C-alpha cells in the first residue's frame, strides 16, 4: 500500500521560508524518487523538483536559488524547504511518486499542504450550532467562524455520518478572517434518539472542537 | 517550456454522453502525455499515461489517444462521479509542464431547493455578533437569488453566499447565505426572513422566524 503523508497546513510570513515533510510508506526512498508539485491560482499545476533514489536533486529553473530538498532513507522522510516566500507562493504543495523509479508519471500523491503566505496571525475558530427548528427531514449544522488561515476540516459523528453532509467553501470576511458552515439533513424523528456532533479541526492553530447540535 | 493548451475551458454534458477533452502542445511531443483527474478537495489522480496506456484501478470508460501536438482524453459514458477538473501533462521536454485544465460540469433535471433558516445561537450573541443563516439544499441549476429582509427592510451588502461544487451522486448544488448583524441591531428587530428565487420554484419561497419564537 504505497502512501505519502505530508505535514499539516500552516501560515508562513512574507520573506520567510517554508518547510514540509513527506513521510512515505509501502516503498523505500532508496528505490524511488520523490517529486514536489504545487498548485496555485497564478500558475496552476507547477513542477518544483525531485530528489532521486541516490540523493541527487533537480530543481525547476525559477526555483534553483530558493529550493532545497533532502531526505532520510531510514526514517522514510523527504524534507522540502523553499526560501523567500511571497504572497503568490500561496498554494497547495504536494509530494508525489512516479510509477517507475526514473519517470514523471505521478501515480501516487500526498494529500497536499495548503501554505498561506501572509503577515496576519493564526486564529482558531469559534463553533456555533445551527439548531434544527420539512416533510420529516430536519436540517442542522455548525457555524465555523473567524479563523485564519485556511483550511478547516469538518466531519460529523467522528466520520460515521456522511450522508447528506454539505460543507460549504470558506468565505473571507472583511475582518480578514474566514468563515464557513457545515450542514446535514437527518430524519426529524432521530433528533431525540441520535446525537449529532460536528468535529471541527483547524490544524494551523491546533484547535479541535466537537460541537453537539440540539434542537433549541 | 512547452505550452499545453486544453480546450474547451468548460465542458457541460449530460449523463451517458461521450465527452472528449483536448490538449494541444506548443510543439510535437510524440506520445509523452499523461492525464489527471482532480475531484473537489482531492489530490491529482492519474488516469492515462503516455497518451493511451491504461492505469490500474481507473474505470474502463476512460481512454486516451493522439500523437504529436493534438491529444484527447475520452469518457465513453460520463457518470455523475466524473464531475471534476482534468489536466494533461507533457514530459517529452524538461521541465514537465501541465495544461491549465478543463472543468467538467454535468447537466440534470431541474431540482427546486429545500430552504431552511437558522437564527443566531444564544452562544454567538454573547460575542456581540449575530449570524443568520439561510440554507438552499440540493437544487439545480446553480443560479439562485436570496433576498434578506429584517422587519420588512431589504438587507443589502451585509450577507455572503457560499456554493458547493456539484454533488458526485445527484449532481445538485447547495447554497448557504449568511446574514451578519450586530447583537444590538438583531435585538432591535423581530421578523427575519430569506426569500429564495429559483427556476424550480413556481413562486419565491420565504422562510422566516420571529426573534424569540
Amino acid at each position: 500500500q504505497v502512501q505519502l503523508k505530508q505535514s499539516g497546513p500552516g501560515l508562513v510570513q512574507p520573506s520567510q521560508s517554508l518547510s514540509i515533510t513527506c513521510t512515505v510508506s509501502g516503498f523505500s526512498l532508496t528505490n524511488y524518487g520523490v517529486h514536489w508539485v504545487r498548485q496555485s491560482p497564478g500558475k496552476g499545476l507547477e513542477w518544483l523538483g525531485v530528489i532521486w533514489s541516490g540523493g541527487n536533486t533537480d530543481y525547476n529553473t525559477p526555483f534553483t536559488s530558493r529550493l532545497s530538498i533532502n531526505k532520510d532513507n531510514s526514517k522514510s522522510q523527504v524534507f522540502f524547504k523553499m526560501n523567500s516566500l511571497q504572497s503568490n507562493d500561496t498554494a497547495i504543495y504536494y509530494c508525489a511518486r512516479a510509477l517507475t523509479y526514473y519517470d514523471y508519471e505521478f501515480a501516487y500523491w500526498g494529500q497536499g499542504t495548503l501554505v498561506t503566505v501572509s503577515a496576519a496571525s493564526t486564529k482558531g475558530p469559534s463553533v456555533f450550532p445551527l439548531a434544527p427548528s420539512s416533510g420529516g427531514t430536519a436540517a442542522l449544522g455548525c457555524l465555523v467562524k473567524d479563523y485564519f488561515p485556511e483550511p478547516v476540516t469538518v466531519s460529523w459523528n467522528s466520520g460515521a455520518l456522511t450522508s447528506g453532509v454539505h460543507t460549504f467553501p470558506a468565505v473571507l470576511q472583511s475582518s480578514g478572517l474566514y468563515s464557513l458552515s457545515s450542514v446535514v439533513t437527518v430524519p426529524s424523528s432521530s433528533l431525540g434518539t441520535q446525537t449529532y456532533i460536528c468535529n471541527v479541526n483547524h490544524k494551523p492553530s491546533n484547535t479541535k472542537v466537537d460541537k453537539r447540535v440540539e434542537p433549541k | 517550456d512547452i505550452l499545453l493548451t486544453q480546450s474547451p475551458v468548460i465542458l457541460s454534458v449530460s449523463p451517458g454522453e461521450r465527452v472528449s477533452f483536448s490538449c494541444r502542445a506548443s510543439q510535437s511531443i510524440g506520445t509523452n502525455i499523461h492525464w489527471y483527474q482532480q475531484r473537489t478537495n482531492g489530490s491529482p489522480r492519474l488516469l492515462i499515461k503516455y497518451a493511451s496506456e491504461s492505469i490500474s484501478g481507473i474505470p474502463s470508460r476512460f481512454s486516451g489517444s493522439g500523437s504529436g501536438t493534438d491529444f484527447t482524453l475520452s469518457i465513453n459514458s460520463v457518470e455523475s462521479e466524473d464531475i471534476a477538473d482534468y489536466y494533461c501533462q507533457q514530459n517529452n521536454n524538461w521541465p514537465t509542464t501541465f495544461g491549465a485544465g478543463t472543468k467538467l460540469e454535468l447537466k440534470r433535471t431541474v431540482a427546486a431547493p429545500s430552504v431552511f433558516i437558522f437564527p443566531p445561537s444564544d452562544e454567538q450573541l454573547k460575542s456581540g455578533t449575530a449570524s443568520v443563516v439561510c440554507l438552499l439544499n440540493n437544487f439545480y441549476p446553480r443560479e439562485a437569488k436570496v433576498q434578506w429582509k429584517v422587519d420588512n427592510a431589504l438587507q443589502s451588502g451585509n450577507s455572503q453566499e457560499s456554493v458547493t461544487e456539484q454533488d458526485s451522486k445527484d449532481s445538485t448544488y447547495s447554497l448557504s447565505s449568511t446574514l451578519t448583524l450586530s447583537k444590538a441591531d438583531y435585538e432591535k428587530h423581530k421578523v427575519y426572513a430569506c426569500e429564495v428565487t429559483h427556476q424550480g420554484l413556481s413562486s419565491p419561497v420565504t422562510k422566516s422566524f420571529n426573534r424569540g419564537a
Binding site: Q39, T90, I92, P169 | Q38, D85, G101, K103
Partner: peptide
C-alpha cells in the same frame, strides 16, 4: 478559469 486552493477546483 483559475485554481481555487480552498476547494482544489477550477473556479470560473
Amino acid at each position: 478559469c483559475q485554481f481555487d486552493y480552498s476547494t482544489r477546483r477550477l473556479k470560473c
